[PDB]
Amino acid sequence: NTPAELEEAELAGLDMESLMRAIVHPLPLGRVRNGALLAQALGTGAPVVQLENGPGGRDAALFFDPAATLSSTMRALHVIRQVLEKDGHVVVVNSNPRMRPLLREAAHLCLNSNVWFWADDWLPGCLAETDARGGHCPLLSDKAQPNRQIMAEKGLVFRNGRFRQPALVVVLDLSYGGEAVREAAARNVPTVALLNGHSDASAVTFPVYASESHLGYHHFFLEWLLRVVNIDPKVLHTLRN
Amino acid sequence: NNSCTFFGSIKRDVVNGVPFCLLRPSRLALDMAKVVRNLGIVDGFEVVQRRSRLGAHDFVWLPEQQPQEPEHLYDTSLFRQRLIRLHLRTDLFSRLPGAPGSGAGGPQPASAQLAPAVGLLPLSVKNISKASQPVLMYPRQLEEAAARLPAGVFMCYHPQLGLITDAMAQQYDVPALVAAHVGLPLSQAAAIRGALRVKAAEEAGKELRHVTQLKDWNMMELLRQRMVERRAALEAGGEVAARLQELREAGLRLRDEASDRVTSALNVAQDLEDGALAWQLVHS
Amino acid sequence: PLPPLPRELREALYGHRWDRVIVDVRRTHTPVRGRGKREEYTAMVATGNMRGVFGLGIGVAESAQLATARAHLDSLSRLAAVPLYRGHTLYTHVDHTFHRLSIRMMPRPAGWGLRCPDLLYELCGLVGLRDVSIRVRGQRGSRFFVAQCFQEALQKQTTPHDGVEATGMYIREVFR
Amino acid sequence: RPTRRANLVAKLMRDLESGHFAAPKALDVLTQYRTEQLSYSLTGIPRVTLPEKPLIRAFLQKYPEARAEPVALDSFTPPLARQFAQRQLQLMQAGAAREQAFTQAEQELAGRLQALRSRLLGSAATAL
Amino acid sequence: SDLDDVLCRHTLRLPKPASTGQEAALRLLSRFNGALPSLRGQTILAKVLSVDSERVTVDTGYNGVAEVPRADVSIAHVHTADGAAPVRPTTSDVRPGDLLRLRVDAPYTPYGDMQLTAVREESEFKRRLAWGELRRAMEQPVSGRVLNDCVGGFAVGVAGFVAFLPSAMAARDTTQRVGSLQSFRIVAMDEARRRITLRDAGVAAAGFRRVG
């Protein structure tokens, strides 16, 4: 088992338990279930372990998947890296009110000028761009980049284009941001979303198998998102060496 | 009945969005499932069993310990109430690194492809034979009714050749008992008839029952071998270096003349601003 | 009222050639709370460039000139590209059904001419189909649905040039 | 009344091949990394049923204080009822029957049960 | 213990209506943990994130963020990992960062969340207490107030629950001191009929055989 021993050596030096504190990831929810994850060859992820105690014994539970969600999560972060360093604009949208202060923490701790954040309600017709708003409220505001105003008030950016329209909207709440995925499809913007099991996610371009149910997943996703967006790879090369 | 049941279940789950196709198996369903996996209409099949009503000990399908592909009915009617689970080919590539259950051995195409979101490419398959009326299409009539229907490959029968397409039906010039007509990309149906012309070039003049039949020959693995050895011969090309170097020399000519035109325009702007400076110096 | 025109569309009107066809103009009726019977003229404008990029535009307004102008500019906003064989015929046989209307469309070799019904003649000359035999079946009483059905039916077919890179298998010899 | 279908790359493709206009800027993203649209149907409701249910039903029927541990859901360290059921089950696949395994699990994990009942009586004196 | 658990998971993975391949790591990583096999009513270790005047923000890790009224929250539920209630100068200074002992009443509401309330229902504390003590008769007394007399005994309001002590396990002087508080001992309860059986702690527990 050279591959298995080599994989164990590869998996020897990392905190697997923190990754499996976020990605073990229990059920999204249990109600009227949508046309959810099918058992297929591309992200099957579907054990509905009912797990209840007698409301019919089957009422509230849904699927899980460890490997797929880690793979999709690293896949989506590499997707964020390529679209970022190809000079696009990344918008992060989640309109669930409970996780908003974490997004404010991310909006104050970010460093790259192209990652943008939104926390309030999704207005009707944000990506319609019918009347010329020069881009809607999620685009270019101090609310979108709170760090840009403060970093320029300090005046020192970590330092050695025009037409602000979105390039890739990532969605961290399908339930209160279903219209955001639909409007991004109407603007031909690719999307990254977390599956909740209720909304029609037939318009997600890059699905991530999380379910908006974890501060731990949000810390894991946002922490890698910030640690790849804040630091340029040559600095890591100089930092390790 | 099994051909129409097979193609009817294909029509079923394509129009219903189910990417798995599960049949009551036979000799026909097994053999022609190997046919459509060989041509790459689907990506693979496995025998499955409704394992909840297996006994305390019936025989059970172990996928690992069994060899990967059954090839007869009796091995697939030993057990109790099997089904054959087709792994439908969703996009315009087979996902050999996926290997969706059964499929081509070895996960290496040469260049990775597009990632299309198309649903399920066997599109509006039409059983044109029919258990009441069998239809022979003598092959020129088969061509003239091939333009009557959209793009795709007929599945046909002939006794000396077995379960065949329309392509070797025409190039061996025999009448063929056509079963149905799959919808397909035009590039795929082009690839089937091109490779079957190549097969007739290899099988030239052989006696017709001695033709390697269409279940015996996986097309996609052979084309994958052609891709692998072709990318190997071109990477280890040599004249490829000279081709690349003359491309480099063309690009260097383009950017050298671009840079020289840049220096000319900057000299023009410097000279004219110096001229305006000197003219304001004179007229003052 | 004011109809919209963008910036990057103004390389295209200076770019390709263009033709315009009104499909039909229709008067609908509504009895309303308060003042009576309000009508709108619904107009449907097709616009192509005779090289395989087609457009449709449906417009609704109170008067015929403003309705046809709105659908005229809406079509020129909304363009889709359709592959042909050398700008005269379609690749495959094409069958489709919008609302419940059975169009059947075939390729024909070039110089067949258009054997084709009334509005679809100007439509095929608009997008650039010179040699196609069609028939429409079902309730043919609406121009709008045969227009939308024809746009989707053009969008249905399959292209051979997305293979030769990745199929290992070269695609030529068109001699019948 | 049309039908939902494929999304955004077959929808961009037949425009983008002809030189309609330049793409939405994330084309390299859209091509280099594999997706899956939710090709939404039901291949079968996978209600894959937990084997731990009869053991946890019996243990929660016999020791209902095993409903009353504090437990960290987000760390995957197992609770006391799970070591009960896993001990009983590993004695099952060892070869013995169920009731002898239940007795051996009563002997081999009772110590944390009196520790827990001391803790619960302490919380009882705390609340009252 | 690892290999036998894994093979138990794989052996129960057989006999399912699909082939279910590439889904067994799902059950392996389920079995280490990730969800507990019975949920309704089970107390958890939960993490407090922030506390307001009324609604406290507490982790679930199972549907996100929990919401409990603060007027139910005490320092008693603050589960320190060492065995003591924490030394804090006041009684409701739940600082965010501690591990809290709360019960999931349901895993999902109509309104996007779970309930997850340790209500500090003192009556439910006595319910879990006395049900556990019915079990713990095989492995200290409980106070009650006597209220009125009738045929066969005396009416005791024990800790929010009204019971009725029979004549056989009753003390004599409980007739002549009706109205005052004194300690009693639980015997059993009948949950299908709501009858609770007690005794005086001075009356010795002569063996009542378990009629079942």
Side-chain angles (χ1 to χ4, degrees), chain A residues 3-4 9 12-241, chain B, chain C, chain D, chain E residues 15-212:
Chain A
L14 84 156
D15 171 350
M16 308 196 291
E17 51 277 63
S18 167
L19 302 193
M20 289 162 185
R21 262 187 184 88
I23 82 187
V24 287
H25 196 190
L27 58 87
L29 270 193
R31 281 270 178 184
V32 287
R33 40 187 174 82
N34 58 11
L37 276 70
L38 190 138
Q40 50 196 346
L42 308 179
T44 178
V48 189
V49 185
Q50 276 79 24
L51 200 35
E52 294 85 0
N53 300 113
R58 295 139 177 106
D59 263 347
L62 273 183
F63 66 93
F64 303 154
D65 204 309
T69 199
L70 181 57
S71 77
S72 178
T73 300
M74 200 57 177
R75 185 191 59 100
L77 296 177
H78 266 295
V79 157
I80 287 295
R81 177 198 270 286
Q82 211 77 4
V83 66
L84 183 75
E85 274 291 330
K86 178 266 298 150
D87 298 329
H89 276 302
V90 178
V91 189
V92 186
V93 177
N94 64 34
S95 61
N96 223 316
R98 276 85 68 197
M99 291 86 69
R100 87 201 296 182
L102 179 51
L103 272 302
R104 300 209 263 275
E105 291 191 334
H108 297 353
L109 261 70
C110 64
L111 269 188
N112 185 256
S113 49
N114 313 277
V115 289
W116 297 14
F117 306 96
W118 178 257
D120 298 328
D121 262 335
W122 186 264
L123 269 175
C126 292
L127 265 311
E129 183 40 276
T130 44
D131 56 62
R133 282 143 271 199
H136 188 73
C137 315
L139 300 183
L140 192 65
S141 171
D142 37 334
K143 291 174 65 175
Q145 290 175 352
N147 196 358
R148 188 210 278 271
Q149 163 191 313
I150 196 65
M151 198 67 169
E153 184 208 72
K154 174 198 300 299
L156 296 178
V157 179
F158 195 70
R159 196 193 338 281
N160 287 341
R162 313 296 303 273
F163 301 102
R164 297 286 179 252
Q165 290 174 207
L168 173 89
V169 174
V170 298
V171 173
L172 298 185
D173 187 76
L174 186 59
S175 67
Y176 293 159
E179 291 83 4
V181 184
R182 266 183 300 271
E183 283 204 50
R187 192 40 177 180
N188 293 318
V189 180
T191 60
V192 167
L194 305 192
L195 302 172
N196 59 8
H198 312 70
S199 311
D200 191 7
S202 72
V204 65
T205 300
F206 296 147
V208 175
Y209 303 106
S211 65
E212 291 91 1
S213 165
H214 272 95
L215 314 173
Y217 189 74
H218 267 275
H219 291 352
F220 169 72
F221 181 76
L222 269 72
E223 195 272 336
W224 288 100
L225 177 71
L226 285 184
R227 273 206 301 162
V228 68
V229 74
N230 284 344
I231 191 66
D232 188 74
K234 67 180 178 309
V235 196
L236 284 94
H237 181 230
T238 54
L239 203 54
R240 292 167 200 277
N241 199 11
Chain B
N1 263 18
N2 296 115
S3 80
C4 203
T5 286
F6 188 95
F7 285 117
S9 289
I10 291 300
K11 189 202 200 83
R12 279 304 221 273
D13 44 19
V14 168
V15 308
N16 291 351
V18 175
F20 286 84
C21 184
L22 72 165
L23 277 297
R24 182 62 57 84
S26 82
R27 308 143 85 85
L28 180 63
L30 275 180
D31 185 335
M32 183 276 288
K34 296 178 264 290
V35 175
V36 298
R37 190 223 70 190
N38 275 0
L39 307 175
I41 310 300
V42 298
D43 291 331
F45 68 88
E46 311 66 40
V47 298
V48 72
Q49 191 164 17
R50 269 180 200 284
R51 286 189 179 177
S52 282
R53 278 157 317 295
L54 289 175
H57 56 85
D58 291 331
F59 266 94
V60 64
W61 183 264
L62 261 182
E64 271 181 351
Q65 283 313 359
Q66 205 68 246
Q68 54 170 0
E69 165 165 311
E71 61 267 55
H72 213 273
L73 187 153
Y74 289 139
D75 302 332
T76 55
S77 82
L78 166 66
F79 306 169
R80 299 284 219 281
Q81 267 297 317
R82 291 179 178 89
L83 294 174
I84 170 168
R85 266 177 64 247
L86 283 175
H87 284 225
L88 275 158
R89 176 210 172 66
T90 45
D91 56 81
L92 264 50
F93 182 75
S94 57
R95 304 131 291 171
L96 303 188
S102 298
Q108 291 181 336
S111 53
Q113 277 75 15
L114 206 73
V118 74
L120 293 78
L121 55 83
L123 295 170
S124 195
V125 61
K126 177 80 147 33
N127 53 277
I128 62 170
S129 75
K130 165 53 209 164
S132 308
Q133 52 177 357
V135 291
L136 192 46
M137 298 186 148
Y138 215 82
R140 214 91 171 171
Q141 295 177 356
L142 186 62
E143 198 190 15
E144 296 151 21
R148 174 142 281 210
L149 277 297
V153 184
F154 292 109
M155 296 313 93
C156 309
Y157 179 74
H158 180 82
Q160 278 70 25
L161 281 74
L163 294 174
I164 63 170
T165 70
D166 62 358
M168 65 183 74
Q170 214 161 358
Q171 306 302 3
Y172 292 100
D173 205 33
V174 298
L177 181 60
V178 57
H181 169 37
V182 69
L184 215 59
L186 198 50
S187 183
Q188 302 188 14
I192 294 90
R193 313 164 82 268
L196 292 177
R197 185 145 81 206
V198 175
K199 181 265 289 181
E202 289 162 26
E203 208 78 31
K206 311 305 162 326
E207 187 174 1
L208 277 296
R209 66 184 183 272
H210 278 92
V211 160
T212 304
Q213 297 206 350
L214 195 57
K215 93 191 187 197
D216 293 329
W217 182 21
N218 189 359
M219 182 146 298
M220 295 298 103
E221 179 68 25
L222 275 296
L223 304 187
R224 177 199 170 233
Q225 292 159 16
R226 308 265 194 80
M227 282 146 177
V228 159
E229 71 174 4
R230 177 67 181 270
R231 185 59 46 180
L234 290 167
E235 268 176 328
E239 79 278 340
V240 181
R243 199 84 192 104
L244 269 177
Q245 206 51 247
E246 71 96 18
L247 262 181
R248 296 315 208 85
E249 281 157 325
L252 277 173
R253 194 161 41 51
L254 276 188
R255 282 81 172 150
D256 286 354
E257 65 91 22
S259 294
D260 283 358
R261 181 180 280 279
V262 162
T263 60
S264 71
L266 274 167
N267 268 7
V268 160
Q270 272 188 42
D271 287 334
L272 65 88
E273 193 77 327
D274 288 351
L277 187 148
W279 196 79
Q280 192 51 49
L281 192 149
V282 172
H283 185 74
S284 63
Chain C
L2 273 73
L5 214 53
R7 209 200 297 130
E8 291 314 339
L9 197 71
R10 299 252 191 78
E11 80 171 6
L13 295 174
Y14 163 99
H16 306 87
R17 291 193 297 274
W18 302 98
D19 189 359
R20 294 150 300 91
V21 173
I22 62 170
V23 180
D24 190 359
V25 293
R26 202 66 187 270
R27 167 168 202 249
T28 185
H29 297 132
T30 314
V32 179
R33 314 320 310 191
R35 291 193 297 274
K37 188 182 185 71
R38 167 198 38 81
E39 61 77 11
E40 293 83 3
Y41 284 160
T42 62
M44 183 46 177
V45 176
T47 289
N49 70 302
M50 304 146 68
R51 283 289 280 288
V53 174
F54 175 79
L56 278 176
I58 181 165
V60 64
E62 303 143 350
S63 296
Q65 293 82 17
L66 277 296
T68 51
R70 277 190 197 183
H72 180 187
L73 288 169
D74 195 4
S75 70
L76 183 63
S77 70
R78 302 193 260 169
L79 279 73
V82 168
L84 311 191
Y85 194 21
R86 324 281 200 91
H88 67 279
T89 180
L90 292 153
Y91 284 159
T92 81
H93 175 94
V94 162
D95 184 351
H96 202 36
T97 302
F98 214 78
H99 185 93
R100 221 190 55 190
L101 187 148
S102 308
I103 190 167
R104 276 189 84 258
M105 201 216 87
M106 308 175 164
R108 283 309 154 194
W112 188 258
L114 291 171
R115 171 168 297 303
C116 182
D118 267 14
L119 73 164
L120 274 167
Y121 179 78
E122 300 206 80
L123 282 156
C124 294
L126 182 62
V127 60
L129 276 298
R130 291 270 167 81
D131 276 301
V132 170
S133 47
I134 322 170
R135 189 166 74 146
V136 289
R137 303 164 183 174
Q139 203 51 67
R140 303 162 273 170
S142 162
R143 274 86 164 90
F144 312 97
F145 307 142
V146 299
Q148 291 159 332
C149 183
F150 177 69
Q151 193 194 300
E152 301 195 359
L154 294 177
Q155 193 54 340
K156 187 180 282 188
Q157 74 190 338
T158 51
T159 302
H161 201 273
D162 51 71
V164 69
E165 70 278 14
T167 301
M169 203 46 256
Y170 172 60
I171 307 304
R172 186 272 303 278
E173 206 262 325
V174 177
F175 174 112
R176 276 143 286 269
Chain D
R1 313 307 158 270
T3 303
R4 295 164 216 147
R5 284 156 313 163
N7 274 97
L8 294 174
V9 55
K11 185 282 211 183
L12 272 188
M13 190 45 147
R14 209 51 51 80
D15 285 303
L16 193 147
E17 181 39 41
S18 165
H20 200 312
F21 283 123
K25 175 142 181 153
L27 181 150
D28 181 78
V29 172
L30 275 178
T31 187
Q32 202 174 4
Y33 313 81
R34 186 58 55 78
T35 62
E36 204 205 2
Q37 190 272 332
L38 273 299
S39 58
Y40 62 106
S41 292
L42 294 174
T43 194
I45 60 171
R47 66 180 64 252
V48 66
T49 301
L50 193 67
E52 299 294 326
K53 298 321 189 144
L55 307 188
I56 300 299
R57 264 176 275 123
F59 189 51
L60 272 194
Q61 202 184 107
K62 171 177 197 324
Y63 292 93
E65 184 178 1
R67 274 171 71 150
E69 301 56 22
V71 54
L73 280 164
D74 301 337
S75 177
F76 63 96
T77 312
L80 193 66
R82 192 185 309 273
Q83 296 108 26
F84 182 77
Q86 285 173 356
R87 197 60 181 186
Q88 177 172 16
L89 183 63
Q90 69 89 30
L91 294 167
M92 290 275 318
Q93 185 177 2
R98 178 175 163 180
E99 309 316 302
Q100 305 285 321
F102 207 102
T103 61
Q104 289 182 54
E106 286 160 89
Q107 287 106 27
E108 290 323 303
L109 278 169
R112 328 295 179 83
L113 263 170
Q114 72 263 9
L116 183 63
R117 79 191 69 253
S118 59
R119 192 161 205 181
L120 172 44
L121 261 183
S123 71
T126 310
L128 179 57
Chain E
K16 292 303 298 163
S19 177
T20 68
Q22 320 312 320
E23 284 190 332
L26 261 172
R27 302 251 201 190
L28 281 179
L29 186 152
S30 308
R31 283 310 149 91
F32 292 102
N33 207 3
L36 282 71
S38 294
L39 197 43
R40 290 247 166 182
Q42 208 271 330
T43 48
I44 62 170
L45 273 183
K47 187 64 64 67
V48 180
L49 275 298
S50 49
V51 64
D52 262 347
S53 58
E54 271 166 340
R55 333 310 301 201
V56 64
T57 300
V58 179
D59 187 7
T60 63
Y62 194 97
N63 201 35
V65 161
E67 183 178 1
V68 176
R70 185 177 179 179
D72 299 9
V73 185
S74 70
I75 208 175
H77 317 100
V78 182
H79 175 276
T80 67
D82 304 329
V87 64
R88 297 202 191 278
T90 42
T91 51
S92 178
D93 46 6
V94 174
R95 304 188 191 174
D98 43 8
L99 291 87
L100 198 54
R101 179 186 297 114
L102 315 169
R103 175 193 63 175
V104 290
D105 186 30
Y108 180 73
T109 61
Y111 290 134
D113 195 358
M114 41 194 57
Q115 271 57 32
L116 192 162
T117 174
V119 194
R120 207 174 78 91
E121 265 172 349
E122 289 302 317
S123 62
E124 209 270 336
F125 290 167
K126 313 332 201 193
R127 177 70 274 172
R128 215 160 198 170
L129 187 152
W131 181 241
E133 281 187 351
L134 165 71
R135 303 273 181 177
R136 273 171 288 152
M138 283 73 74
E139 69 272 14
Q140 320 203 31
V142 190
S143 59
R145 289 206 178 216
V146 296
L147 287 174
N148 71 284
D149 68 311
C150 59
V151 193
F154 322 105
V156 174
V158 59
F161 278 83
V162 183
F164 176 71
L165 156 62
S167 60
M169 282 315 158
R172 318 269 71 87
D173 309 341
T174 53
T175 309
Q176 64 213 10
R177 287 186 188 248
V178 167
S180 76
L181 176 75
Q182 67 269 15
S183 298
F184 286 111
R185 182 72 273 177
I186 198 78
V187 182
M189 311 206 197
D190 199 344
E191 195 189 341
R193 305 173 189 165
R194 295 194 162 207
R195 183 189 192 189
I196 309 187
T197 317
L198 316 177
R199 66 171 167 100
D200 202 312
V203 171
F208 161 61
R209 274 291 61 81
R210 311 170 71 192
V211 177

